Design an enzyme around this catalytic site. Sequence first.
Site, PDB file in Angstrom:
ATOM      1  N   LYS A 107      54.992  29.727  37.430  1.00 52.42           N
ATOM      2  CA  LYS A 107      53.770  30.258  37.203  1.00 52.42           C
ATOM      3  C   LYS A 107      53.461  30.607  35.980  1.00 52.42           C
ATOM      4  O   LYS A 107      54.104  31.181  35.240  1.00 52.42           O
ATOM      5  CB  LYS A 107      53.380  31.409  38.153  1.00 52.42           C
ATOM      6  CG  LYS A 107      51.937  31.811  38.031  1.00 52.42           C
ATOM      7  CD  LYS A 107      51.093  30.808  38.595  1.00 52.42           C
ATOM      8  CE  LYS A 107      49.545  30.980  38.310  1.00 52.42           C
ATOM      9  NZ  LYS A 107      49.225  32.589  39.294  1.00 52.42           N
ATOM     10  N   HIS A 161      48.730  29.962  47.400  1.00 50.09           N
ATOM     11  CA  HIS A 161      48.672  31.079  46.189  1.00 50.09           C
ATOM     12  C   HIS A 161      48.437  32.294  46.971  1.00 50.09           C
ATOM     13  O   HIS A 161      47.098  32.759  47.207  1.00 50.09           O
ATOM     14  CB  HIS A 161      47.468  30.474  45.401  1.00 50.09           C
ATOM     15  CG  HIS A 161      47.312  30.891  44.104  1.00 50.09           C
ATOM     16  ND1 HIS A 161      47.215  30.614  43.119  1.00 50.09           N
ATOM     17  CD2 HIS A 161      47.265  32.554  43.719  1.00 50.09           C
ATOM     18  CE1 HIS A 161      46.969  31.259  41.827  1.00 50.09           C
ATOM     19  NE2 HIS A 161      47.272  32.515  42.523  1.00 50.09           N
ATOM     20  N   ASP A 214      44.387  32.907  46.934  1.00 51.38           N
ATOM     21  CA  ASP A 214      44.545  33.822  45.737  1.00 51.38           C
ATOM     22  C   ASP A 214      43.951  35.261  46.346  1.00 51.38           C
ATOM     23  O   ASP A 214      43.414  36.121  45.694  1.00 51.38           O
ATOM     24  CB  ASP A 214      43.506  33.526  44.637  1.00 51.38           C
ATOM     25  CG  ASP A 214      44.027  34.382  43.483  1.00 51.38           C
ATOM     26  OD1 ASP A 214      45.217  34.617  43.232  1.00 51.38           O
ATOM     27  OD2 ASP A 214      42.974  34.287  42.432  1.00 51.38           O
ATOM     28  N   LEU A 227      39.292  36.310  38.740  1.00 51.94           N
ATOM     29  CA  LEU A 227      39.496  35.344  37.809  1.00 51.94           C
ATOM     30  C   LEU A 227      40.301  34.077  38.315  1.00 51.94           C
ATOM     31  O   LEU A 227      41.253  34.062  39.130  1.00 51.94           O
ATOM     32  CB  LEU A 227      40.384  35.781  36.695  1.00 51.94           C
ATOM     33  CG  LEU A 227      39.898  37.087  35.938  1.00 51.94           C
ATOM     34  CD1 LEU A 227      40.914  37.517  34.974  1.00 51.94           C
ATOM     35  CD2 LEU A 227      38.817  37.099  35.381  1.00 51.94           C
ATOM     36  N   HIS A 233      43.324  44.962  45.356  1.00 51.07           N
ATOM     37  CA  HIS A 233      43.181  46.143  44.805  1.00 51.07           C
ATOM     38  C   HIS A 233      42.566  47.545  45.604  1.00 51.07           C
ATOM     39  O   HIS A 233      41.493  47.281  46.332  1.00 51.07           O
ATOM     40  CB  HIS A 233      42.334  46.031  43.394  1.00 51.07           C
ATOM     41  CG  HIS A 233      43.023  45.115  42.640  1.00 51.07           C
ATOM     42  ND1 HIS A 233      44.015  45.472  41.699  1.00 51.07           N
ATOM     43  CD2 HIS A 233      42.815  43.570  42.424  1.00 51.07           C
ATOM     44  CE1 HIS A 233      44.297  44.284  40.831  1.00 51.07           C
ATOM     45  NE2 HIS A 233      43.706  43.340  41.427  1.00 51.07           N
ATOM     46  N   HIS A 288      47.577  29.043  35.945  1.00 46.38           N
ATOM     47  CA  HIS A 288      46.197  29.673  35.767  1.00 46.38           C
ATOM     48  C   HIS A 288      45.903  29.156  34.596  1.00 46.38           C
ATOM     49  O   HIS A 288      46.079  29.524  33.565  1.00 46.38           O
ATOM     50  CB  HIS A 288      46.675  31.268  35.897  1.00 46.38           C
ATOM     51  CG  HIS A 288      45.164  31.898  35.722  1.00 46.38           C
ATOM     52  ND1 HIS A 288      44.780  32.942  36.667  1.00 46.38           N
ATOM     53  CD2 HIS A 288      44.374  31.774  35.161  1.00 46.38           C
ATOM     54  CE1 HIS A 288      43.663  33.514  36.303  1.00 46.38           C
ATOM     55  NE2 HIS A 288      43.209  32.779  35.178  1.00 46.38           N
ATOM     56  N   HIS A 292      43.551  27.799  41.866  1.00 45.37           N
ATOM     57  CA  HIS A 292      42.209  28.336  42.023  1.00 45.37           C
ATOM     58  C   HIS A 292      41.208  27.583  41.108  1.00 45.37           C
ATOM     59  O   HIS A 292      40.650  28.508  40.146  1.00 45.37           O
ATOM     60  CB  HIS A 292      42.085  29.791  41.991  1.00 45.37           C
ATOM     61  CG  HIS A 292      43.031  30.408  40.825  1.00 45.37           C
ATOM     62  ND1 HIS A 292      42.840  29.844  39.572  1.00 45.37           N
ATOM     63  CD2 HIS A 292      43.946  31.317  40.765  1.00 45.37           C
ATOM     64  CE1 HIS A 292      43.417  30.658  38.543  1.00 45.37           C
ATOM     65  NE2 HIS A 292      44.192  31.365  39.208  1.00 45.37           N
ATOM     66  N   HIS A 351      48.808  36.926  46.525  1.00 44.53           N
ATOM     67  CA  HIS A 351      49.547  38.194  45.808  1.00 44.53           C
ATOM     68  C   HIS A 351      49.661  39.120  46.932  1.00 44.53           C
ATOM     69  O   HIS A 351      48.818  39.597  47.656  1.00 44.53           O
ATOM     70  CB  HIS A 351      48.620  38.851  44.770  1.00 44.53           C
ATOM     71  CG  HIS A 351      48.285  37.897  43.847  1.00 44.53           C
ATOM     72  ND1 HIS A 351      49.145  37.578  42.590  1.00 44.53           N
ATOM     73  CD2 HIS A 351      47.310  36.764  43.479  1.00 44.53           C
ATOM     74  CE1 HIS A 351      48.665  36.660  41.894  1.00 44.53           C
ATOM     75  NE2 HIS A 351      47.676  36.074  42.135  1.00 44.53           N
ATOM     76  N   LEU A 352      51.081  39.563  47.119  1.00 44.59           N
ATOM     77  CA  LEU A 352      51.546  40.556  48.018  1.00 44.59           C
ATOM     78  C   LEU A 352      51.849  42.115  47.450  1.00 44.59           C
ATOM     79  O   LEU A 352      51.935  42.906  48.205  1.00 44.59           O
ATOM     80  CB  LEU A 352      52.722  40.071  48.585  1.00 44.59           C
ATOM     81  CG  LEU A 352      52.529  38.886  49.402  1.00 44.59           C
ATOM     82  CD1 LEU A 352      53.945  38.229  50.160  1.00 44.59           C
ATOM     83  CD2 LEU A 352      51.495  39.402  50.640  1.00 44.59           C
ATOM     84  N   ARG A 353      51.716  41.868  46.187  1.00 46.46           N
ATOM     85  CA  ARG A 353      52.045  43.179  45.583  1.00 46.46           C
ATOM     86  C   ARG A 353      53.470  43.756  45.880  1.00 46.46           C
ATOM     87  O   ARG A 353      54.296  42.920  46.042  1.00 46.46           O
ATOM     88  CB  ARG A 353      50.844  44.198  45.773  1.00 46.46           C
ATOM     89  CG  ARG A 353      49.547  43.762  45.683  1.00 46.46           C
ATOM     90  CD  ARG A 353      49.327  43.262  44.094  1.00 46.46           C
ATOM     91  NE  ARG A 353      47.867  42.988  44.046  1.00 46.46           N
ATOM     92  CZ  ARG A 353      47.242  42.090  42.964  1.00 46.46           C
ATOM     93  NH1 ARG A 353      48.054  41.405  42.139  1.00 46.46           N
ATOM     94  NH2 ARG A 353      46.084  42.159  42.947  1.00 46.46           N
TER      95      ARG A 353
HETATM   96  O1  LIG Z   1      46.590  39.548  40.526  1.00 46.51           O
HETATM   97  C1  LIG Z   1      45.760  39.897  40.309  1.00 46.51           C
HETATM   98  O2  LIG Z   1      45.129  40.733  40.322  1.00 46.51           O
HETATM   99  C2  LIG Z   1      44.663  38.541  39.880  1.00 46.51           C
HETATM  100  N1  LIG Z   1      43.356  38.493  40.281  1.00 46.51           N
HETATM  101  C3  LIG Z   1      42.437  37.630  39.911  1.00 46.51           C
HETATM  102  O3  LIG Z   1      41.334  37.529  40.483  1.00 46.51           O
HETATM  103  N2  LIG Z   1      42.954  36.293  39.422  1.00 46.51           N
HETATM  104  C4  LIG Z   1      44.196  36.503  38.706  1.00 46.51           C
HETATM  105  O4  LIG Z   1      44.742  35.646  37.999  1.00 46.51           O
HETATM  106  C5  LIG Z   1      45.121  37.513  38.979  1.00 46.51           C
HETATM  107  F1  LIG Z   1      46.498  37.448  38.610  1.00 46.51           F
HETATM  108 ZN   LIG Z   2      45.332  33.192  38.627  1.00 49.61          ZN
HETATM  109 ZN   LIG Z   3      46.877  34.529  41.659  1.00 53.18          ZN
END
Ligand SMILES: O=C(O)c1[nH]c(=O)[nH]c(=O)c1F
Ligand SMILES: [Zn+2]
Ligand SMILES: [Zn+2]
EC number: 3.5.2.3
Lengths: 343, 336
Positions: free
Chosen positions: A99, A13, A247, A219, A251, A136, A174, A15-17
């Site tokens: 997803k 799980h 996860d 989250l 940011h 999620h 998560h 996020h690479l942006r």
């Molecule tokens: O992509 C994120 O910024 C992000 N951050 C989170 O903490 N929960 C998420 O479900 C999510 F999509």
């Molecule tokens: Zn999530």
């Molecule tokens: Zn996520």
Amino acid sequence: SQVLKIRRPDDWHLHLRDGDMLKTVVPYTSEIYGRAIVMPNLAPPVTTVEAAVAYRQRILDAVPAGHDFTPLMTCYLTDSLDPNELERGFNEGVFTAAKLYPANATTNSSHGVTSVDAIMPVLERMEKIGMPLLVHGEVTHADIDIFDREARFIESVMEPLRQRLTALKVVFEHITTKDAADYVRDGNERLAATITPQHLMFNRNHMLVGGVRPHLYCLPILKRNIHQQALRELVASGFNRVFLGTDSAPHARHRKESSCGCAGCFNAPTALGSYATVFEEMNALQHFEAFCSVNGPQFYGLPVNDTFIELVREEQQVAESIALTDDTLVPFLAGETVRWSVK
Amino acid sequence: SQVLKIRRPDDWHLHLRDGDMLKTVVPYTSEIYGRAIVMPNLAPPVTTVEAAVAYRQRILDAVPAGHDFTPLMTCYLTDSLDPNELERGFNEGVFTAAKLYPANGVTSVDAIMPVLERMEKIGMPLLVHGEVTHADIDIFDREARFIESVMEPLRQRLTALKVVFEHITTKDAADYVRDGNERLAATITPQHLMFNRNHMLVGGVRPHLYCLPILKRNIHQQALRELVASGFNRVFLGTDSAPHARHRKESSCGCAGCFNAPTALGSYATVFEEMNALQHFEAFCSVNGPQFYGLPVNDTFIELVREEQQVAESIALTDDTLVPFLAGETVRWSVK
Ligand SMILES: O=C(O)c1[nH]c(=O)[nH]c(=O)c1F
Ligand SMILES: [Zn+2]
Ligand SMILES: [Zn+2]
Ligand SMILES: O=C(O)c1[nH]c(=O)[nH]c(=O)c1F
Ligand SMILES: [Zn+2]
Ligand SMILES: [Zn+2]
């Protein structure tokens, strides 16, 4: 100096942006993990085969030379998503999974789902072709307390869905509650879960006692300690349908430390050592490898990595920050002394 | 168009800080409130008469001319505190009350019983930040826990001690106070009436709603709004206005405290109106406190207009800025 050799891990799980952020954060995953589940929540979201293919290449472009890293792409489910588009992506090996983010009647049909009921045709195609659904698991109604959103999702969405689509493979992403931990423990072979390092290491007190810590704000929200303990017990048990998903969700600093801080921990740099610290404390290292490197692949029907990686119990300080083109990024556990480090 | 005339209010729980911050923040209080309970949590804390006399005068020096404002000073209770210092400071009109902060402050009731017994004998009111601080206790339980473990056993031991349960945030405290006797009262802040924890944590994390005690579930919020609206007369206005510089709020570790003095009175008006209970608004603001403390009510009046007056995004300081509670927002009632 103690050593832990495991088959190379995967991150189920992530996020690479995109753009520059992506160029910065990719290496923290690709130097360690063999594969990662790359989440689809771009702006605009990844909801076509063609967007997923292009996103994949941008990821591959940003992988340092010599790193053996394969991103596994996902489709963001939307009301407007054509079941045939999702199937062609699955069939072409573009989409490894789909997803489902929390529903909202307010959401534009190109950006999300109004309700599960409204997307039964796509979910039925997934069940039919054996595509895993990653969830999620929160309901976002304004009158539900934020700490209750996950438990409420279980009763009002997850169980009715799984009782309706009995062949559907589902990853409860998560999980953060005993409610989810028990639900998943007591489930069948078509149900699994990922757990982040933060939800194992901390509870809500860590985010809120003696100051507000937005770098621990993510989250689903960190819950009271009884939930943290149920999660630790679950991984420590050796239960084989729980696996690593960081996860990692980066940011820029100014977006985290604002009057309205964005949710997400940038834990890719420190997550592996952090999981290792948790398994140790739970007296459960015997189950560490399977969590990182075996349970995920088995659930997804994919091979186990055949190379190895070693962690050492040598104390290392975590960087205070990580430079981006325009701002900086504060890693998870910035400036602290982590117990286990990759050799 | 609607105008609501009330007796001049007082603030029975206020943080004025010190120095340049004090200069910036007192006018937001002194221009409205006739009196305020000024808490002693300076660095270092106000634990002596002399410190309080100097503090009072630093406060009075920053009060614009033409504002009639009297700061009511408090002693910071400490384990070792001499009861004679507390008492001389009472008898000279320096200390109006003594404030109890659990360490993370004061270590235990037992350590300061001679002080508490002295207060009971001389009739000095005790103001309590009622939370336990043990690490094993979840932050949302610290208020309820304090009641059973500290408050109730304290008030059985000292039957004649007057206690203000400051900034109550829970149904537990609301019921405990509602059912208590004439020697127990409570303050309630604007934020604990207007918001619950969803407002601080949904759609983003909001440091400027972060304060202590922490915002609780809606059922607790609703308990508080009902308590004020009932007309119960041992609840009164205490804002807990608690200013921090913007970047001490908007950091990797934000300080607790809402700077609500600019906007608290209008915000309370909204809560009472929403609750079909404006007839109880004046007493909450301008009569219940004074009756509990045994002081006269103010003899001037102010007016509130139901005109939408927008809250400033920020307020200048010598370095950084100060973000008011509800910055950039609309308030529904404003002082005329
Ligand atoms: O992509 C994120 O910024 C992000 N951050 C989170 O903490 N929960 C998420 O479900 C999510 F999509
Ligand atoms: Zn999530
Ligand atoms: Zn996520
Ligand atoms: O003085 C402060 O900053 C402060 N802020 C709070 O939010 N609660 C307190 O109890 C306190 F003493
Ligand atoms: Zn307090
Ligand atoms: Zn206070």
